[PDB]
């Protein structure tokens, strides 16, 4: 309910801050690094900018890149899901050490993860964009939203919605400290299609809920209602990858010599 | 089945 200190309340902060600290271990680029870049805060670093097709061959030459002739769009389609299973992979050790997580049933860990990868991708990315452009390649390039509305026309409606998502969220001016408990909280949820056992499921998030209202109270005086603009997110969310998979229907049937990725078609599988 | 997230959880 209310505004007295919580006897509950060291454990609350206990475990935002065990959260906090397993986060940035299983996240390289966070969320106070990428601000800085686009900040010209940090010297070190200063990513080369994608504005056309010009500036894309000299930034895919100065840029090492984990992938990489074919097309441009495919090339660049290619990378996004190579970053993508990549979060896969940081989304999983993560998961693994909220407390709780690994004692619940295997079989509906994996349920959990499989809907949750893309919700947590979107508010990973938004972290990395602002109205114009995504940091890609661990911070060391700048892809811009207008050059990749450019691509032709299955390609260059991908990333929209996404930009179109990072631009209401980050006017919450939200956190590292609020996203990792964020994440925890999407993760766990009860409301997943498949769950055999959603008590223990149900137990461990009220708790995450607990330690998130604690922690945007202390973190965030300056809006009054934060708390409940942010479950309002999880809603948006699912609705938001509900068109991503159901786009990414048409690629598939648009384009012959594709090939998802066996991870990715696996998440995709039988998804809502 | 679900085989690679499955490996994964190790
Ligand atoms: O879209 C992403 N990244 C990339 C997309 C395309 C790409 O392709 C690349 N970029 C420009 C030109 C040619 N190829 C590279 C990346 C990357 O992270 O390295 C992405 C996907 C998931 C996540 Cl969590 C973060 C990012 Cl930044």
Redesign the interface.
Known sequence: IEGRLNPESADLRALAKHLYDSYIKSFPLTKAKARAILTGKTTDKSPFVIYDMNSLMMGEDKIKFKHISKEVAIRIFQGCQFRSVEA??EI?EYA?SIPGFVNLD?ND??TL??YGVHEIIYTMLASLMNKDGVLISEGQGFMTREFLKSLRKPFGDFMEPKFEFAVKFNALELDDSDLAIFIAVIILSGDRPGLLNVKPIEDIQDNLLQALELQLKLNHPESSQLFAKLLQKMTDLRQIVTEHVQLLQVIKKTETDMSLH??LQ??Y?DLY | K?????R??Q
């Open positions: 896969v992979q999983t693994k295997l860990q994996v993860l499989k066996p991870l696996e998440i599988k | 679900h085989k690679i997230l499955h994964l959880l």
